[PDB]
């Protein structure tokens, strides 16, 4: 059917690494699934699609920003103006991508979850994309984005603490991204370290609960948790 055709097209777009089209296909899948919930597979295809589309503009934004600061530190103000105009184009694309996924998540998927599985997943994703907004927005828009991020992550954390094993890859990913939020967005290294440490310990504490299928996913995140701590614990030094 509609749904199945566009799911397959989305998988093809992924293979071809034509991710803007993958988002289009998954947006058509999600729209075709109105009352029903997305499958685990469709949820993951949607997430991969948006992660890659935003990831590419995020990379470009960081690079153009480094160049902007260097050329600004230099007396070529003429170069700096051009770089700022270009970064503005990138920020426009970033804003439009976040608006697309936040509306789709906010209008269909979050209301439709009622699974706690998917509740935490979609809440984490809402927080993620508000955070990607907070990465480049300024003034009140940055404030609003960061506040919505914190609120999304908190709601996610409540459902996850109450209904997901400490070794659950969704709960672990949420902890990871929430800690990153504190370190990078809120500039609270103490808070970020505390949260990452807690999520790791609570997962090795109850490390029996982990699933064979769940293991590659969880262990990956837990290593990232340690890796973050490894840098933070060293920037509590540097």
């Amino acid at each position: 059917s509609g749904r199945e055709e566009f799911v397959y097209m989305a998988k093809l777009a992924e293979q071809a690494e034509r991710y803007e089209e993958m988002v289009e296909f998954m947006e058509k899948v999600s729209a075709a699934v109105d009352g029903d919930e997305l499958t685990v597979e469709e949820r993951n295809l949607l997430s991969v699609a948006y992660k890659n589309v935003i990831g590419a503009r995020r990379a470009s934004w960081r690079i153009i920003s480094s160049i902007e600061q260097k050329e600004e530190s230099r007396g070529n103000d003429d170069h700096v103006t051009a770089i700022r105009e270009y970064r503005s184009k990138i920020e426009t694309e970033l804003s439009g991508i976040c608006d697309g996924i936040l509306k789709l998540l906010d209008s269909r998927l979050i209301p439709a979850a009622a699974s706690g599985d998917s509740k935490v997943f979609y809440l984490k994703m809402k927080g993620d994309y508000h955070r990607y907004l907070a990465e480049f927005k300024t003034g009140q828009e940055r404030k609003d984005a960061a506040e919505h991020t914190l609120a999304a992550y908190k709601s996610a954390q409540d459902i996850a603490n109450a209904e997901l094993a400490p070794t659950h890859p969704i709960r672990l990913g949420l902890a990871l991204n929430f800690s990153v939020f504190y370190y990078e967005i809120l500039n609270s290294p103490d808070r970020a370290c505390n949260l990452a440490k807690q999520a790791f310990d609570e997962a090795i504490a109850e490390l029996d609960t982990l699933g064979e299928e769940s293991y590659k996913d969880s262990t990956l995140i837990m290593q990232l948790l340690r890796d973050n701590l490894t840098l933070w614990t060293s920037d509590m030094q540097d």
Binding site: D128, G173, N177, V180, E184, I221, L224, N228, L231, W232
Partner: peptide
């Protein structure tokens, strides 16, 4: 810092 895949 790194985030979830």
């Amino acid at each position: 810092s790194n985030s979830a895949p």
